[PDB]
């Protein structure tokens, strides 16, 4: 599923990302935009045999298990396929755990490069959420 910007903002808000561990909702919408263009089925294969999955491009080497990634830690204790659903539940649960590490949202390079420090709230303005 490819989410509309405001549609995702409302869903992420329902899923608790608005002001989660100090991060305003704008950060997550902006991050989703740069990571997958709001596409839940986005996948990206890496050189190390790992794959990024979903709307927030979560890695199979550390966060989820796809049953065929070497060095799998499965920190979110979830099959990667759960991160490709039209239902964002699993991706948010995992993101909420990833961001609970000291590195916070710096876990998402696209966020650091394209969102960190900007007027992230711009991403949710205009939205009736």
């Amino acid at each position, epitope marked *: 599923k490819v989410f509309g910007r405001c549609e995702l903002a409302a869903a992420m808000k*329902r*899923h*608790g990302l608005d002001n989660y561990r100090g991060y305003s909702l704008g950060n997550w919408v902006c991050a989703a935009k740069f990571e997958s263009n709001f596409n839940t089925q986005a996948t990206n294969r890496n050189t190390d045999g790992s794959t990024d999955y979903g709307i927030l491009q979560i890695n199979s080497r550390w966060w989820c298990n796809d049953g065929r990634t070497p060095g799998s830690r499965n920190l979110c204790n979830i099959p990667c396929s759960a991160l490709l659903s039209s239902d964002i539940t699993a991706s948010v649960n995992c993101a909420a*755990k990833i961001v609970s590490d000291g590195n916070g949202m710096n876990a998402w390079v696209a966020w650091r490069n394209r969102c960190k420090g900007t007027d992230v709230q711009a991403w949710i303005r205009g939205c009736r959420l």
Partner: antibody, heavy 113, light 108 residues
């Protein structure tokens, strides 16, 4: 198949250090974020802190300064250190996964001279 | 620090009765509220995560609802093995905090 177990001195003297070990079995200590939660008399639960995958820790501000959470990847255990204890630190201590899906049986530590 | 207030402090019911336990937050915590059960001489058990999400392996009679500052843990016809303490815990902001708990006891 992940199981946790707390172990350590059951008695600590006022002003001394409380040390507990949490042994992780079934999975690696690097396969999750790990926490320490204690329960005071009167059903009062306190989330003491946790250590995440990067080694970074988060400590409860009310404790902050007296507490340290560390891990040993070779023994697959993580630990709790609480300095300068007082009678008010008497409680049941539990180690648990950050996800809350696995908890140790808990161990009582009493502070008394 | 976020304060969680649970009510009632205690409630006595007959097995088969259905109940609703309240947990209120001093600040909005969105859906970042979890429910635990702790029976006598046992460790806490996670029943519902993120306000309303089911956990595989937990009896279907347990369900959660709410958002923001108002949450409810519901039990469809309480069973003989459900008596004990129930606590809510928030993970929206550090430090994580627990409610004071509600004790579910047997009515006679």
């Amino acid at each position: 198949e992940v199981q946790l177990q707390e172990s350590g001195p059951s008695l600590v003297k006022p002003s001394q250090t409380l040390s507990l070990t949490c042994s992780v079995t079934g999975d690696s200590v690097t396969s999750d974020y790990w926490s320490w939660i204690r329960k005071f008399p009167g059903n009062k639960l306190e989330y003491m802190g946790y250590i995440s995958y990067s080694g970074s820790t988060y400590y409860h501000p009310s404790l902050k300064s007296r507490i340290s959470i560390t891990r040993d990847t070779s023994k697959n255990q993580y630990y709790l250190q609480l300095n300068s204890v007082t009678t008010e630190d008497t409680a049941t201590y539990y180690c648990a996964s950050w996800g809350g899906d696995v908890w140790g049986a808990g161990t009582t530590v009493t502070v008394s001279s | 620090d976020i304060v969680l207030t649970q009510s009632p402090a205690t409630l006595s019911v007959t097995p088969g009765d259905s109940v609703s336990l309240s947990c209120r937050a001093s600040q909005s915590i969105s859906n970042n509220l979890h429910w635990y059960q702790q029976k006598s001489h046992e460790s806490p058990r996670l029943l519902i995560k993120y306000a309303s999400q089911s956990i595989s392996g937990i009896p279907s009679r347990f369900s959660g609802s709410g958002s923001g500052t108002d949450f409810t843990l519901s039990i469809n016809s309480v069973e003989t093995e459900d008596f004990g303490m129930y606590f809510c815990q928030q993970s929206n902001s550090w430090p994580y905090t627990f409610g004071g708990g509600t004790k579910l006891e047997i009515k006679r």
